[PDB]
Amino acid sequence: HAATELTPEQAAALKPYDRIVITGRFNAIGDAVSAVSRRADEEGAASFYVVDTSEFGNSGNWRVVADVYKA
Numbered sequence: 001h002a003a004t005e006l007t008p009e010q011a012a013a014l015k016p017y018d019r020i021v022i023t024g025r026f027n028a029i030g031d032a033v034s035a036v037s038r039r040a041d042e043e044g045a046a047s048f049y050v051v052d053t054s055e056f057g058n059s060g061n062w063r064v065v066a067d068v069y070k071a
Contacts, residue, residue, distance in 0.1 A: 003040030005033065006047035006069060016067035018043060023056055023063040032064045046071035 006014070020039050024032040033050060040048035045068035056063040 001041050002037045003045050003068070004047045005037070006049045008049070010047070011049040011067065011069070014047075014069045016049070017070055018045075019051070019065065019067045020048070021063060021065045023061065025061045029053065036064060036066045040066070040068040043068050045069055 020036060022032060022035050036048050047069045049067040051065045051067055053062055053064050
């Protein structure tokens, strides 16, 4: 299994039980979103929502904060 990418429309109609944060030192946005898809599924979430992708203190090493939603 893997958590489904949830649109801001469906996400606005749901409240997250938790929010997962990962770090990704400049590889790919889809690489990071795949890690969010994995980890959200490992938390038992049906879906996830990428909130923000921001540089973790310094440039190059950014991080992805993302909500997670149950079924």
